[PDB]
Design a binder for this molecule. Structure first.
Ligand SMILES: C[N+](C)(C)[C@@H](Cc1cnc[nH]1)C(=O)O
Ligand code: NA
Ligand code: NI
Length: 405
């Protein structure tokens, strides 16, 4: 369980016995409910509760969706023990909630529709979470200590899914100005030498859970490189803004210039000018910017444009994964980091039972690697592939740079 690829929670969730997965499910639910109570403390109980935006979902919808997904792949799943060989579309038991599928299945309930749904109230939503988890843990307790990877697959999957939605709660709270009880400085900007080598990129078979987009592992050639030891700080990033870099379209790509054309505010989000200085928004509060913090809420175009101005580039996801795994002193986990790699399948990819996790998003999404401060330690992993459209700035995204010698 001790590795440089992730914290012990991450390896215990992916490969550990039922006791470890049980611990992960309880910890995930504790986090989910604490975030839910922090949203409730700001918003109260009205539904939908929040104004509309494409990158938000109504708080009670997120809670129900977390329960719905767990119940879909555990309690209602008639082929749990088959793991990745489960037939996605087999007929399942009915949910505790008759309208659950019509409300919480995201591939069926169009986004704008969610704001008008007659969802269960705040307390009935928590009852649904409670009962589904009680059922989940009871089925988990039937597994023996040496339970096979196939027997534990969906218990690991639903735990990781809830972790992803907790992080979404954290960055949606930033958008909404909601302060959280669970809620950033970097150390020295430095350069590290990555020598030429071979990397066996992706997840192997002996280890337990892998996301489908991590398969199959394959060899990749890594060229000699000098790579930042940490994400780009504000002190490093902001001279680009000060040199009028946002008013100089030569620094930007085709899609970057397009995106920059529509931009009302020509600097990173959640920043604002204050005299000759800067303020940054955090927990709905504006505070003087810390230059030694990581630059955050930048999109792929902003990261690439800084790189062109600086004469550097983004790493490929292979270069990133190699450095994270082989270079002590390469520090990650403060912000997700845009790479230069589009989200594409590895050689031998095959979609897993939750078929819509990766495959619909190839090509239109850019890979980010690492983790941010709001990523659960049970999820954060040097082989994990995050994927968002290159324009997104609501997520906790930044970057690091590199250049060949
Ligand atoms: C892996 N990311 C974070 C890109 C996913 C996580 C996810 C949550 N429920 C389904 N998938 C996303 O935002 O769609
Ligand atoms: Na490290
Ligand atoms: Ni989801």
């Amino acid at each position: 369980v001790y590795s440089v690829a992730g914290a012990p929670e991450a390896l215990a969730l992916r490969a550990g016995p039922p006791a470890s997965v049980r611990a992960a499910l309880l910890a995930a639910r504790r986090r989910t409910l604490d975030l839910a109570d922090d949203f409730r403390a700001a918003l109260g109980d009205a539904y939908p509760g929040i104004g509309y935006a494409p990158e938000l979902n109504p708080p009670l919808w997120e809670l129900g969706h977390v329960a719905w997904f767990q119940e879909w792949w555990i309690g209602r799943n008639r082929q749990r023990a088959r793991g990745v060989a489960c037939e996605p579309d087999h007929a399942r038991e009915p949910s505790l909630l008759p309208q659950a599928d019509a409300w919480y299945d995201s591939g069926r309930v169009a986004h704008r529709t969610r704001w008008a749904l007659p969802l269960p109230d705040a307390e009935a939503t928590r009852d649904y979470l409670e009962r589904t988890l009680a059922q989940t843990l009871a089925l988990l307790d039937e597994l023996p200590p040496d339970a096979h990877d196939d027997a534990l697959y969906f218990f690991r999957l639903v735990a990781l899914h809830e972790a992803m939605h907790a992080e979404a709660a954290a960055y949606m709270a930033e958008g909404l100005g909601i302060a959280l009880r669970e809620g950033p400085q970097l150390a020295e900007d430095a350069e590290l030498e990555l020598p030429a080598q071979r990397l066996r990129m992706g997840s192997d078979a002996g280890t337990g859970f892998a996301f489908d987009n991590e398969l199959l592992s394959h060899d990749v050639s890594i060229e000699p490189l000098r790579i930042d030891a940490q994400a780009v700080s504000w002190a490093r990033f902001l001279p680009f803004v000060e040199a009028g870099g946002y008013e100089h379209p030569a620094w930007w790509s085709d899609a970057g210039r397009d995106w920059l054309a529509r931009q009302l505010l020509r600097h990173p989000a959640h920043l604002r000018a204050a005299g000759t200085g800067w303020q940054q928004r955090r927990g709905g509060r504006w505070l003087p910017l810390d230059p030694q913090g990581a630059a955050v809420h930048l999109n792929a175009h902003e990261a690439e444009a800084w790189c062109r101005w600086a004469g550097r580039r983004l790493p490929t996801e292979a270069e990133w994964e190699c450095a994270a795994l082989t270079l002590p002193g390469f520090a990650w986990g403060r912000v997700w980091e845009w790479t230069s790699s589009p989200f594409e399948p590895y050689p031998g990819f095959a979609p897993h039972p939750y078929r819509d996790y990766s495959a619909p998003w190839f090509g239109t999404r850019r890979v980010l690697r690492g983790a941010c401060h709001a990523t659960s330690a049970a999820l954060a992993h040097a082989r994990y592939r995050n994927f968002f459209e290159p324009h997104r700035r609501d997520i906790f995204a930044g970057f690091r740079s590199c250049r060949a010698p």
